[PDB]
Amino acid sequence: IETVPVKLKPGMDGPKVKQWPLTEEKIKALVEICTEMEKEGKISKIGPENPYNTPVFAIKKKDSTKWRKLVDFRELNKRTQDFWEVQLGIPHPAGLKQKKSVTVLDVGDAYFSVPLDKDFRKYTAFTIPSINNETPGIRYQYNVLPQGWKGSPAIFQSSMTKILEPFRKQNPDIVIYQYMDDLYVGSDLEIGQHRTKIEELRQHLLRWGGYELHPDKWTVQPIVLPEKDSWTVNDIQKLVGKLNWASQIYAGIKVRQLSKLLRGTKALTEVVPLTEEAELELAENREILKEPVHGVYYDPSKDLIAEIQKQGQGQWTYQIYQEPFKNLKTGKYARMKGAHTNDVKQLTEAVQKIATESIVIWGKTPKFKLPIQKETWEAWWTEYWQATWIPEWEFVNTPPLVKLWY
Amino acid sequence: PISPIETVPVKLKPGMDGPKVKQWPLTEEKIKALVEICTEMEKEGKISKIGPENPYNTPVFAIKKKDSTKWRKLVDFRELNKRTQDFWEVQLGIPHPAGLKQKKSVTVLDVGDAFYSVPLDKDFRKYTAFTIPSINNETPGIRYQYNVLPMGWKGSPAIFQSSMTKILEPFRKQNPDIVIYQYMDDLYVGSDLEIGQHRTKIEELRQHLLRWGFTTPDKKHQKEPPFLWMGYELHPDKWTVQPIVLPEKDSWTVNDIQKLVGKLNWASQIYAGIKVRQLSKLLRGTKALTEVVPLTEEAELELAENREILKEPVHGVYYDPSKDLIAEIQKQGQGQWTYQIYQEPFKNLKTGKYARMKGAHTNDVKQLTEAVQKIATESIVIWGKTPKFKLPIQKETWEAWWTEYWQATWIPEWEFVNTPPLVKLWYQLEKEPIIGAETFYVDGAANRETKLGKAGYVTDRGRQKVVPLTDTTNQKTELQAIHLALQDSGLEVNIVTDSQYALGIIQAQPDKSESELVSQIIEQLIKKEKVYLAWVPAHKGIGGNEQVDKLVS
DNA sequence: TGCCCCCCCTTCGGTGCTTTGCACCGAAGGGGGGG
Ligand SMILES: Nc1ccn([C@H]2C[C@H](O)[C@@H](COP(=O)(O)OP(=O)(O)OP(=O)(O)O)O2)c(=O)n1
Ligand SMILES: OC[C@H]1O[C@@](CO)(O[C@H]2O[C@H](CO)[C@@H](O)[C@H](O)[C@H]2O)[C@@H](O)[C@@H]1O
Ligand SMILES: [Mg+2]
């Protein structure tokens, strides 16, 4: 076929990111996978005169015992030209989040049938490492649209719609959204009748070349205030601090008539009775906290941001926003992995589910602010990753000034 | 000979041209060294004569090879290197002997004149122009250019290593149960064949290399143990480092101490217990490499301790993939950790140390977690798997850390080992305020422009204090206010501050810090029985905090 | 008077914060070791 001409953004060079260490079982899989891809012409062996590089690793799903090659093209996608500027982007359908059930299918393999602009291939280089550095690294680059590259869904756009249009006519009320290498397909059909047109969709795809989501129980967790019969000075201090922060989010929340309940230099354990005008102020603030914030709308031109907090006993609060204090979604992720013990696994799973929810709802992943040391995350996260995409993230150490989300 | 392998295409960076750098003077012993190398490299075709249409030049010299009676030719391509394209280096790390398996038959070969057997891109040769001086005064010089990889060019190591990899690959695939460790032109070749068949495969490997232009001189063909390899000595059952000689000096310069620490760090891969904290402390705040630094008392002791450790003979063992990897860690003090990795007890594969201070404020549990993470990474690099850990921390200590620390943290499978000093939390803040304890409302303000501030407190028992502070900061006065409350309170205290900054540091429960004032707060926290620390927003008129903020302003 | 790689220890300069210093991070300087 003919290649589509592709550019990096003006004044940017290709990625230059070092490969990180890999286990034995991940190196063998990459060697098995890439030698087959070389034989099928999808990748080519290259040398050091190509100055670019992108890390590679492998993931294996709990349900799917096979290894899946994953190239971390985050750096390259940032530097790749916009395709919304060239009008080949994928519109997000609003209805998907409405559906009873949504299944995710990995269709990255379809990209391997379309060649890549010969002048862009060098930017796709990656290096397989060696155990105990027995040999130098082995370098390949792509000849076809790479999995994980943001240009592949855009170039394959025209083709995917024609492969899908018979299924789309046959089934008008199922909605299909392509995001990177994934197809998110949702419907209202029975918990197990839905799954069968999944299987019919996949055979039509296997003709040419995870688990069930359920959005109508992606409940929001609001800010809630304690309930007691008796209140210590410390309780009132903490409650005044919690609402003083929340007044940056909501409108007309007031502390004047709980603050002066604490006039004087009082002991932290002394039990202060509640005036009527303080119950006035509290029961009302409970109601503003009840229902969502007025005036908060999604903007597709701006980035999504996600913050997470460890709360303990297996639970994790999160907020998604674009401008600070204008949350599009507040939530609480709970594990049931078994032993309660592994924080890094729970947070890695939390990031995948939160990012999955943004794809379903808005069509793109958020930039995560992760409550973890950089090198604790990098020591362990690939152990638990199951997605074909990788969101952007950064590492924060914000102590909890107030327990706002519990 | 020159390999018939295809050359690797190389470019100069865009906009750039070639180097133009006149030659400098060398001895006669080194001019005749190179003329013998250079009329003889010309006869084998490694270089060619050029002249004035080629406008480029680059200076050349020679140093003596570590084998004596042989000279290494080198050209100062510093200029050309800057205008030569970037490369992606394929040497990703260094092989370690603890990653090797026991082998029945072992051979070590080295390729002769490795770089000179690999040709250079035809179109790039003209940028390698140089000149041979011949006593400077007698003749202007003779111009040559390289037809092969020059020693000193930025791209030569990568292009050699990648070339060697292509040449080896037919042999590796045809012989999957012969391990070839390939570092530059140095080949370790192990196998589980009886020495007869082994040497057949060896001579066939050498003949395959010869067809592609890589000689293997007998001189560097090691056939018997101990093998000299990558700085080590390979015996059949064990390995050792080649002897480590440390400097011994009446008077030490900064550069001497820099060399001492580097050798000790090298020794720490097999000698357990090495420490360099106090020797490296001497390098701080210094301003010159020739500055004489007297050793502190603590540095003399640490050096003496290391010298005792090094006088003992040590060895590592090789990797048995059918047995688990076990990593054991001990605490040494002042943020220093040492570890051993083994499979059978008292049979170390290797050792190591971790001694970095990450953060201005941290604690032993954080640093133990970092040591675990470094060991985990090193184990992946060497063996492709993480080890089971044996740690001097109790399950209750760890469990108390990951429930009251707000960041996600983790540590793999580990067995508690009782090797004091144990890692422990040195205090824990109460989750709830303390009945009967005094309540201190602390506050401190500083003048951005003046440097002058005050720290102070108010108390539910009527106590008050304000101390004036000079040359201070906003964040310091808040830390200082907490310092006062801890200084004047009893064994159980309730403290209310309005600085998220101060709350953040102390709630992370640090036990050490680069700040003397934070260190003072830590020593006071450790002597207390119970401490509850609480935050409130400032300037919202909340009782206690408002009264103390009045008093500080 | 050279090149490339890994490691550790120290110093410095850039970034973001509802900041005015502070904490973090990556690069660069020295050392060790390899070819
Ligand atoms: N100080 C050094 C040592 C080595 N090398 C590179 C170039 C060498 O060609 C190659 C191999 O190192 P050797 O010591 O084996 O030197 P040679 O192979 O060139 O010659 P010999 O026949 O003596 O081994 O590594 C280098 O650039 N600078
Ligand atoms: O974890 C950060 C660490 O990862 C690297 C690649 O190993 O960068 C990746 O992650 C960043 C954070 O999202 C991206 O900005 C970047 O594009 C991506 O390659 C390292 O560069 C970085 O140290
Ligand atoms: Mg050699």
Numbering used by the authors:
A (entry chain B): 5 to 213, 231 to 427
B (entry chain A): 1 to 553
What text appears in the publication on this structure?
Fortunately, the RT/RH domains of HBV Pol exhibit weak sequence homology with human immunodeficiency virus type-1 (HIV-1) RT. Here, we report the acquisition of 3TC/ETV resistance using HIV-1 with three HBV-associated amino acid substitutions (F115Y/Y116F/Q151M) in the RT N-site.
Furthermore, we determined a series of crystal structures for HIV-1 RTF115Y/Y116F/Q151M:DNA in complex with 3TC-triphosphate (3TC-TP) and ETV-triphosphate (ETV-TP), and with their reference natural substrates dCTP and dGTP, respectively. We determined a total of four ternary complex structures for HIV-1 RT3MB, including RT3MB:DNA:3TC-TP, RT3MB:DNA:dCTP, RT3MB:DNA:ETV-TP, and RT3MB:DNA:dGTP, to a resolution of 2.51 Å, 2.56 Å, 2.32 Å and 2.30 Å, respectively. The asymmetric unit contained two HIV-1 RT3MB heterodimers [p66 subunit (chains A and C) and p51 subunit (chains B and D)] in complex with DNA (chains E and F) and NRTI/dNTP. We also observed a closed conformation identical to previously reported conformation of HIV-1 RT:DNA:dNTP/NRTI ternary complexes. In addition, single Mg2+ bound at the N-site in a typical octahedral coordination with three oxygen atoms derived from the triphosphate moiety of NRTI/dNTP, two carboxylic oxygens of Asp110 and Asp185, and the main-chain carbonyl oxygen of Val111. The α-phosphate of the d-isomers lies closer to the 3′-hydroxyl of the primer DNA, whereas that of 3TC-TP occupies the position farther from the primer 3′-hydroxyl, and is instead closer to main-chain Ala114-Phe115 residues. Electron density for all Met184 side-chains analyzed in this study was well-defined, and structural superimposition revealed that the conformation of the Met184 side-chain could be classified into two conformational modes: a “normal conformation” located near the ribose ring of the bound dGTP/dCTP with appropriate van der Waals distances, and a “backward conformation” pushed backward by the exocyclic methylene/oxathiolane ring of ETV-TP/3TC-TP.
